Swiss-Prot record:
The lineage of its organism: Eukaryota, Metazoa, Chordata, Craniata, Vertebrata. It comes from Homo sapiens. Zn(2+) 2 binds at C15, C18, H31, H35. This is Zinc finger protein 32. It is found in: Nucleus. It comes from the Eukaryota. The gene is ZNF32. Belongs to the krueppel C2H2-type zinc-finger protein family.
Length: 45
């Protein structure tokens, strides 16, 4: 139940796929990995 704050303007890195914006490329890149079909999954927690 987050406040619901969206629409900041235009970020240097956006996930056109869904619309997830980020500050740096990496941050976003890691997010996009959620869309990609392939799955690698981590090792441990
Ligand atoms: Zn996305």
């Amino acid at each position: 139940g987050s406040s619901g704050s969206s629409g900041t303007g235009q970020k240097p890195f956006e996930c056109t796929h869904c619309g997830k914006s980020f500050r740096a490329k990496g941050n976003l890149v890691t997010h996009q990995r959620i869309h990609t079909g392939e799955k690698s999954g981590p090792s441990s927690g």
